[PDB]
Amino acid sequence: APSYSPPPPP
Amino acid sequence: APSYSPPPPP
Amino acid sequence: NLFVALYDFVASGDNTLSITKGEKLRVLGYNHNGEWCEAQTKNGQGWVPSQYITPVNS
Amino acid sequence: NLFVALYDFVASGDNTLSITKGEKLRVLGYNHNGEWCEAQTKNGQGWVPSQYITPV
DSSP: OOSSOOOOOO | OOSSOOOOOO | OEEEESSOBOOOSTTBOOBOTTOEEEEEEEOTTSSEEEEEETTEEEEEEGGGEEETTO | OEEEESSOBOOOSTTBOOBOTTOEEEEEEEOTTSSEEEEEETTEEEEEEGGGEEEO
């Protein structure tokens, strides 16, 4: 999976 | 996934 | 094991998959920290934000 | 767990991923009969024949 953070839920 | 068979190993 | 997208998410490279609110998807697994999950839709696969999805009929 | 392609396989749409012998991949899941596995390479994701890969 990407190492970075997903965006937070809107 | 595909419903059909993969090609057998060559 | 069937999930539905709660919010829109557009892929941003690195094997992410875009999903549209309302869209159904199957989940294959989670990454180490659970923030991402590997989703399969009728017509693509890739990582989406675990927080952007919820099980169907829950 | 890292995998390596044993043979070339060519994607024919259908959510498949073309892979080349010697290419490294990650395996993310399997279909119900195990014939296909969800692979991830440098080039993208998609299904590949489970029989075409083996762990590195």
